[model samples]
Target: ADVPAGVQLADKQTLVRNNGSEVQSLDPHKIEGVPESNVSRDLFEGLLISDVEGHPSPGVAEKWENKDFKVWTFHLRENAKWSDGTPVTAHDFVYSWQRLADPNTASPYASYLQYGHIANIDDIIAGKKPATDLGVKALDDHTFEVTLSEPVPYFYKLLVHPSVSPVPKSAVEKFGDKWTQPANIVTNGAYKLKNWVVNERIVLERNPQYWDNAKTVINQVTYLPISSEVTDVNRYRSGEIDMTYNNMPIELFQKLKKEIPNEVRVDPYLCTYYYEINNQKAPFNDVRVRTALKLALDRDIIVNKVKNQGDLPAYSYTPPYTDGAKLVEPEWFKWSQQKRNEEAKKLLAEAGFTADKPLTFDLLYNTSDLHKKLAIAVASIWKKNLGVNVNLENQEWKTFLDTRHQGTFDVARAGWCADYNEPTSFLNTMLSDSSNNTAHYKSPAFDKLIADTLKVADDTQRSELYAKAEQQLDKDSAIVPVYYYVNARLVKPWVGGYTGKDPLDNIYVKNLYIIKH
Candidate 1:
């Protein structure tokens, strides 16, 4: 690999990075948040590794092909080996994918495999069939085959997700629930887990057994679990951290860009920050009420004044720059703020709210400075426009997630970062059965449209179906879209080869090299 001019490989190969938040878990099957994904990618290799742009590249499986557009076959590298010196085999993927779909595994991302229509996956997640019945098969040792329930266009992109990464079945069965700990874990990626201190830091060392070990440049990487946005940037300033993957406040981002222009990176991130309305709740259950709540929000003000983080006002769930995303934009989203507020008040009145019986509800948000400010702004908007009374509640990330999953809140702060660079990654989350659908939104019409998208072979027609599915959400007001994300990060001059363009913000340390001078 060619090193760009003015950046030379450093003699000190260790790189310390500030991870944005506390990791939920290290177990790939059970992990839910982005910080956990940072750790998981270092310790495990899937069939493919995503490029910095979010495109699939060869990993454990050197190449793959779709046999009949429904049945896919992957050819594993013969020399691949686990960190423990065990030869990597196709059975590892078969077992790992099966474990993900197993109800007993309790993976929230199990819905992803089901969305891919992996044969018998639905039955497995429903507990009607054993995990052994999953569609993936290990033909001999190096050949892996998968039979999908339907033809999916973005099937290759799904292979890059951490949840589907291969795990050593022997270590898992021996260690049980503790298989992901540093002492017990066995991995197959460019680096092997060396140490982990909960809510502090995780450390990794180069894996000699990696098939592409010769090309991997970084010798060690340390990920510091910094949950505070301010603290994350401060560490970078104090020279305690070499690079950071977290988003800092817009004010700080501006300051850093002015002071250290070479270190600042602003890229279009494939994510949407939004609010989720509980369709199972009283007032929110009414489409008119949901629409009123959405309409009352001044999205331009929220993005520019409150967020001010280079975010675009979201008109659709899928963000821009994604393939097939430009096909549709909701026409209703084009209304001016004044017109929207007037209509919002009318809808609230029709939903049985008046000056005496004003609309009242609780809004839930996780602990974040940006979220706190945004919640206050939204409350003010509702009070002024629709005369709604809102009680703001704040909770930690873990508890917030649990509460939302239980559908206990009238409305909750929510966001979705694309797992893959496709419309389905955003679309499937709103499916009636999707685990990530925190709103508890259910509609057979919307569900059928999303399901039909997978069966279509033509790219144009499939995207057209995706448009219809997005339109359904607009009509039902299943959830409120606030803004699309723009990722801004700070990296030292020495840090090279990292580009945070992937919607998942996936980083490959193996491709990164540090410069000494």
Candidate 2:
């Protein structure tokens, strides 16, 4: 239970936690996984952030005002400073945001800039215009201005992502790509990186130079990159960790709920688990084949029996908790299992597939006991219902991401958690030019609808347009929505200010403090 050997725990102010896995990267623009994101939030401060309840809150900028619907100006707090004692200013944000939008940075998340409410972002990302031409300006040392191509309703919410967090130009230029290492990393959030002993643990200490240093609790926080679900549970039971975040095994949910009811936590999360079919490839290139594959699998069995958690079967890509939108599913999706199977077979036959020369494809998933079992369940369903053959391929996390991004797999496991509270956050991921669109799905109508939805100010009209866009995805069978996620975790009762249920999954160590009896 004591801080691992050489590390010193901060008594009441220390929190030893369990993260899903090792972080992939620390660079603000380079992070793609949630584990790395969780760490990034603690190390960098965005201009604005969502509170635990998903409401807008001032971060580095104490307050902000709208010059007009398309223009926003943020006023920074004078006290904020980087971990290196350098003053945090409007220029930091201007430099960082431009870097993400710049094509030379090669950030996989660069595509986000086009949708992230910045003007002229598309051209800059396309390399037709210079990164400096993007629509952000440091009006002064304390004031920053943003010009959007069109009015974006959820712009503040979008700022919570690390891509918008400021980075010190001096540090980056001095250390080159090595700036994120513990020795050179300069942050401006509640905590600073102390040590990152890869595959073992990452250590963070309170940033004395942080703007709100006086109020920030948890002098020391240690994240153990314990990959195995069994190891995470054992560590929590042994009183070695204060809390566990993400990637908990579904099999353990029931046992934990029964044995330690107080510790088992499940809360609504804006996330969807789905399967992506590479439309650029053969077989799946036909909508009929994709529909047959989607219909053959039973979603109820996967979420209820296989997961055994309180997860809901997903009928739409957008999760249930999103605001101002009603997601619709095809009527056939709700039909009885027998009816769906009958339709699936008919569709496969029409697509020139039969039991003799079966439609076979590789199903790719990441390495995990839970994912393996889910893949088996899905493969069994296809085999039994439509006489289809599915070869499952499992890869480690990094390899899985690269393989899927390369579009080499026939069908790959995919999931998306909302970066902001808007429906656009989910819908935009599948846009034709979206870097996150792993399916290679391109539809002129779908892309136009999404673009139009962004310009409308009325909530009702925007929702209706979004509904139609989602319908297009459903009609094309662009992807299969397996289930909606509920963030399930275990937090010791003494862990105060840990909600474990934010719809956006926003976690802040600054709001956490030990409760001493």
Candidate 3:
């Protein structure tokens, strides 16, 4: 049912309490990351979808209105019904939105929901008033409304998020703990989660009760999770699975593309591969130290000699082709590696350090051949250039992610794909107080600029604001950006109609097919 790189992400069911095939269900109300999120998009309907041109189009809602910006209204589709015979209406949407804003939830993405059209959401979550006092309200069975503190231009796109998906009242009331499970599962999309096995396989069967089921061509889909390059390629070749993705290694890519080029699919994903230094940790506390560390990096050397896997080396957090923003690549490779080292040495000396006084620290990465290779190469760069005695700490993906979020290591590796075509998603999350600012970095100027951009009604003003923010980010040296990731995947010829054109490297399989043998 789904295929993509699984190293950085896992299933939504893993977040729930009890997960098993018989009782597991894919609920759209809570989801993050790939594959699992792909399942969510297939099984649930949103009020709108951001089209190929990056604009919202009506989905579940027939039409919507913001009569005065103080009050917004949405008209639900009459034909929308749940898999278990319940009607999907304004009440369902009301409950779902309120649940996420509730203080008891403690959702990470909840703050994001409040940033724009739902600015009142933050105040509501902060115990200012009732959740219903939120800009959102349901006028009746088919009509819903929302009032915002400021004019929200992106409210329709926000509704496409999983947390805003409608939920049946009974599922929350009766089987609260098991609401998302098979025993209580109900959906109003083309398919429903029939079964799931943690880290193994997930099955989605067409919804017999779906209003648009007649238009949905594919009937049954099965998704197998394979992360290893060797295992994924072997399985696809043996026909155990209908399709697999870029989980294959670069060595395998060259070999297979030569014999069967048509079976390979490659595309540039709007994702930035970068590393962050824990500001709360020692040595990293000094801005000069951070700047010195970044100065020592030779991105072109690593991209060409070490990571010649086709990814463009990055000098900034934002990747290329991000809404047509022109970002020139850094000229780090114009000079030899020895010359780069000399420059790093000068920066360190100005900061009052020398070859005898090396900066000693540990570098952390997930346990994969690629990550390990990149880590060794980067550590050598820092050691030779800045005279830093760096130690390698390789852990599994699970452990690495936990430490990254908790700010445990001196220097940690991470990556982020654009959620939408917005610079706010990258800057605000990595540095803001409310987002994935795990590095504990705070820049008042950076925060204010982004907050102001969202309020600006003019695109030109917003673009200027974002550029200022990016330049400030570079000056602060909060993160050492490595490269902009390009997706590499191997797809069986039998698979067709799937879409991998997202900024986030996710493929929507609702239209995908596995031609019968």
Candidate 4:
């Protein structure tokens, strides 16, 4: 194998990264968020791993083909082998994916294949069908086939998701829950789990048997769970680490941007910071009430003054960079502040609430300076503009997660980050059956629109359906779009092939190298 075309490997191939917090689990099936995902990519490879630009590239599969975006076939690389010296067969993917939706597995990413439009997956997740009934099979030792329920044009994008990464069934069956431990793990990725010291650090060593081992420039990748974003940057400056996580002190943004021009990166992240209105509850249950609350919000103030980051005022929950996305805003979105407030008053009056008998609700936020300031600003805006009484509420992260999931608050501060750069990544989560539907917003029309999007084969057509879905959301006022997030991080100039261009912030260690000074 040859070295990757662009990277010039340095003498030392050790890469130190600052993962903001300890990951929930190393199991790809149990992946809950970014911290685990960052590590998982190195320890496991899916059929493909999208490049930093979000373009699908060869992984275990050398080449793939799809039939009208419905049926897909992949040819596995002959040289691909697990860390323990076993062949990475197509059957591994078939068995591993079924494990994700198995009832006993209880994987957080259980419904991921449902987004892939994998036939019978929803039934498997719902326990009506066996995991073995999943619509994937190994046609031969090297060929894998999948049948989709509908035409999913963006199917390749879904293949790169960590949730779909194949696990060694023999290892899992023998070791049970301990299979992912450093000593027990047998991975097929460029790197294998070397050490894991809980709450401290996780280490990955280059897998000598990896198909692309010769091209892998980095020998060891170390992930340290540093709690503070500020401290992570401090460590970066001192040469203790080479990279920082997505956030740091907002006050330090301008200063750091000035100091480390090459290191600082601020790009539009594929995430939207929004508010989840409990549509099952009163005031919010009424479209007029919800609409008034959404309209009265000055999103510009929320983004510019409150966030102060390079966040864009979001009109749609799906960020602008999302592939095939169609941005839409309500008529009131273009109106002046006075006009929007006037319309809000009319809607509130029609909803049977007034100055004396005001519509009162609590605005819930997590315990953080940013969340607190945003909640306060939103509450103040609603109160002053719409004569609505808002009681502010704050809770710790764990408690807040439970609170939001339980649907106990009138309007809870929330955010949705895209798993893949697609509108369905945001829209599907709002559906009634979606586990992420904390708002409890059940609309038959909205559900149908989302469902229809899966069946559409054309990119523009599917996006148009998503446009209708977003309009339905605005009409129902299911959620309030505050702002789309920005990826703010610091990287060492000594790191080569470091491109954080992907809106999802997927950084693959194999594609990077340490520059020799």
Candidate 5:
């Protein structure tokens, strides 16, 4: 694969998602933030992988079994090979898990491998014992075995995650210092990273040694990370990009929708775009203040007026698709403005503040124009409804993460795109453990319910268990669900087999061949 002489990419270092690339990193353990994880989803794959419909399907590991819920075994397909012609094996899985569990990796998603199903992984990551002391072991060249700390009905879903993907020991050993850098790295997935220019472009070439190389249909795929809607539209007009996302500026959306209606496409995704009130600090620490602020958010304003895209104002933590048999709206809606204000003032009064004394809190947002608009809308609503002086603190992505992870900000805007079509991916990751629970919001009831949900063997029971957990979460106002996401992409007609899944809009490039000219 080669770039044209005049065309230049935005940056070459964007192996992670939010940095600039639509897909993130080649390494699974590095999937701490959204960017890294999204990229890893495409560039790398694990034992089990999510199909186009978000169902778990065979990857390198063709089949796995656990009988007593302790000893788990996986059978790797003999034909599977990494891009460099290295055979994918059980040892690769073993090595990769150990690497991620290594404290030196500094992976924020390290807990992803620990927590529920993975027995003793938390202990291993926390230094109670060596990685070998945890659950997994290689039985032979093609077989791997695992033990769980407990019975985890949803264990297979976790295996779909990058942290569980096997990295060839040879690739890491050969590269020595720079295993993950462009030149030295290898891939087992449908595509190989050709180049990454940060905030500009990312290029992926069909992997010759990919286990399913014969089935891979796309010759190459590219990402143009143009932030400006004008520039992005111009590129699409000039045929410089394959796609652009839902973030088109309002002015640009209007202009493009009329001039190039064919290019504007609205794609629905599983991502639940929501606002999180950090409960670890300040007035948010008080339940009434949190409850009052949640009540003030009128989702319709941002969904319809601020963001023109056809998005439903989120009334519950669970998206419309996952409302399941039990259709329960979020509890935040239970409080009317009158009730919300009365309660907020009552709580503030008890906390030693009054109408004369206003409580202050910070609201953090990403530097996107729409996000800023949404942020201001939320801030103004709080001011009007609860008479709280909510300070709007908007920052760039990097600065926002710094404040959020450090628990410095009062209430920050955040979201979750489902990791394998599971409620646990959102609840357990955000509200369960002390780490991913960035707000440090903890409830023994919530945690225990999540644990119980994961262990249920019956499908209907499991769904019900998860629903109960979500209901409790809503009651607690752990985080306010704002709006469900609908992604709009400008796709060329020639692109085939491209099923737009959010946040990656995952292109089935391996199965996508340019329609016959």
Candidate 6:
């Protein structure tokens, strides 16, 4: 493979991008959303990196092998070193993977390692065994090993997931909660955190000690946290940023796309924008009301007219071209807007609500200009068609995640970007035991189908189970599928090697460079 090999870059080599919002946390295990993952990817690298084809490639580990699909071993590159000149050791992965699953850490992705069929992850996450007992070991200074509870053929691919990224144990222990603070942070990735001034801006400078410093091009990364997509467009035009976020304001989406045809890059992104209903709560627990709300949503208008980005109106949770699972649309999917609206009214009436006493709820979302517009549009449609009263509510990023996770919201704006590019990445979130299950959907039948997919080795058998699970999701109506995401953003003509081809939409500065426009 032709690696992006080059030389140490000058101070002038900088790439600025519109980081959608302030990140929640940089601690690999605690990261809850894409904002954190964006910064974290620049600051730390996982054991494996994705190739252009989205296959596992070498990262920290130069080479690896597995025996009988149960025990995997990695040979770490001796050249790998932290930004502070500390050698990156296998011990770091050992300590961090254990910390990630520890019940004390309260990590959001705590179940990640466990589901890979790791030997003792079940016991650790259940608090029945110590985290140290997890099936990971540091055989030597540069050798890392993991033992699985069962045969896992796709185990190699699991190394690329964000949660598996190793963090500096010495730094984490020394600084405690402040380890991620720019003042104290040390990174093993190509760039190191340089400045973090709250909401103003976050900066990362090239790490000279990085093993592949010669392969890196962009010497500095400047992340500007702008909540408004309109402002993002204005700044991108003003030449303040080289790349924009995934959304451009709807008002200018068509105009911008028409005006600068060469600059706009849209690609398949593995994500779904949806409304997660708290199924444990009152009106939402009533399937009639839930189904009515789902039917009333105008996904076609939202996808084509409002987003205007080539995104697709999603009738099912998993979108097309996802690995193996064929979609199964609900019976209402083919109905016209007016017909669906008529049925919505009947469903609400059947659940004992009429025009005199209509269904009402608050639609919760985070602080973003794009999200607000989407909420308003969906809310307006609901009111016009179903006669439902929706109170709009917004909170800053952290508070919003907390509120949504706590299940206090009636219907909340939600987006699911796969942690890995597989069907289970989206389906697993609906599982009762997953912390990511914000909707509180609990179905043993659905859970069994998802779990069985892992057990089945035959591709045809697994696809059958996947289709059954997808059909079950539609039957439950616990979540309202809005639209499938397209990686919509602006890129400068001079930014060479820029790519949005992969489903993950991950940006690695090491593969990009600036040339004369």
Runs of candidate 3 with Cα error greater than 4 angstroms are 1-30, 50-55, 66-72, 324-340, 347-357, 391-400
The lDDT values for all models are 0.84, 0.84, 0.66, 0.83, 0.67, 0.84
- State in Å the error of residue 363, model 4: 5.0
Q: Choose 2 or 5, whichever is better by lDDT.
A: 2
Instruction: Output the TM-score of candidate 1.
Output: 0.95
Compose the digit string of candidate 2's lDDT tens values, residues 267-361: 88889998889998998999999888878779999988888788888878888568866777679777998998999999999999866799998
User: Candidate 4, which ten residues in sequence have the lowest lDDT sum?
Assistant: 1-10
Write down the worst ten-residue block by lDDT for model 3. 13-22
Q: What is the per-residue lDDT of model 5 for residues 1-517, given as tens digits with 9 covering 90 to 100?
A: 1223443333321211112223334567655555455456557778887666556788888998877665678899998888888888888888888877777775656777665456677777777888776577889989988777767656676677667777767877788546777787888888788877665666777788887776665566665544455555556667655555446666567667788787678777767777787776766777766665666666666778777678787766666574232446655456565775676566666776667778787778866656666788777876776677867776655566657778887788886666555566666765545345676688888788777764666667877777777777777777777888877656665554456543334334454445432
Alpha-carbon shift of residue 418 in model 5 (angstroms): 0.8
Q: lDDT per residue, candidate 1, 1-517, as tens digits?
A: 2357767678988889987666767788887677778878888998999765667898889988996678999999999999989999999999999989988887878898977789998788888999999999999799999999887767888887889999889989999988888899999998998988876788999999999889788899999877567787888889988887656664476677789988877777888888899998997899999999888899988988877768899877777667777547766678788899998888888889999999889999877666777899999988988899999998877678779888889999887888888888888888888867787999899899987876666878887788888888889998888998888778898887876656668887887888785
Instruction: State residue 112's C-alpha deviation in candidate 6, in Å.
Output: 1.2
Q: How close is candidate 2 to the true structure, as a TM-score?
A: 0.95
lDDT of 6 by residue, 471-515 (tens): 888888888999988888999887777667778876677777777
TM-scores of all candidate predictions against the true structure: 0.95, 0.95, 0.85, 0.89, 0.85, 0.96
Model 4, TM vs. native: 0.89
Off by over 4 Å in 6: 1-11
How well is each residue in 395-514 modelled by candidate 4, as lDDT tens digits? 754456567668788899987788887888888878777766778999999999988876655677877899998888887888888888888888887787766778887778988887
Segments in model 4 whose C-alpha atoms lie over 4 Å from true places: 1-10, 281-283, 342-373, 379-403, 406-410, 454-457
Off by over 4 Å in 2: 1-10
- List model 3 lDDT by residue over 347-410, tens digit each: 6777777667767888897655566677888888887777888888977554565677677889
Off by over 4 Å in 1: 1-6, 501-503
Candidate 1 clashing pairs? none
Clashes of 5: 13
